[PDB]
Amino acid sequence: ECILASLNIKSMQFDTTGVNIPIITELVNDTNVQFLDQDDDDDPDTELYLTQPFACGTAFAVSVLDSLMSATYFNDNILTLI
């Protein structure tokens, strides 16, 4: 449903096309990123943070939040600052 809605928003036209609306999409499977954009070098081996949608900021996932445990173990005030 999320990929379908994002595709519909990016494809549907107006009175101005429909590629200028900003969308942030929540995702649970990182391999599904390649369907969200059409001009990119698709590769399932590539990690999330090197991908065009994540670099543009029009995507997000809960998998990238595992690093915060190690970061907050090493620095005590990081979680409070965040």
Partner: protein
């Protein structure tokens, strides 16, 4: 969930002042999204400040090299020198940047400003 952080806080031997910190996934995720609604890109910018990544160079002159030089940065906490007491926060900010290319974002005052 955000309706169980209170239950966790209710434990008798829990001292979040000491450093027992509980990461709430929903709180941080939805906060990232909501703050990105104010300014686009802040979500990915904040998410890339914690993955302990090293600097990688790309010679193709594309956006990969610039964004990778961006992600190479990280953040830390460290006590600062004693020579900066009577001065002002903007003053130490600009002095630190122009001298050793270090920029602050917050200080402990208890309270974080």
């Amino acid at each position: 969930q955000y309706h169980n952080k209170a239950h966790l806080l209710n434990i008798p031997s829990w001292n979040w002042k000491e450093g027992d910190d509980a990461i709430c996934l929903a709180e941080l995720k939805l906060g990232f999204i909501a703050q990105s609604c104010l300014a686009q890109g802040l979500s990915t910018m904040l998410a890339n400040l914690f993955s302990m990544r090293s600097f990688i160079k790309i010679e193709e002159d594309t956006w990969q090299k610039y964004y990778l030089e961006g992600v190479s940065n990280e953040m830390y906490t460290e006590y600062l020198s004693s020579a900066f007491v009577g001065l002002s926060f903007p003053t130490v900010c600009e002095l630190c940047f122009v001298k050793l290319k270090l920029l602050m974002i917050a200080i402990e005052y208890s309270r974080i400003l």
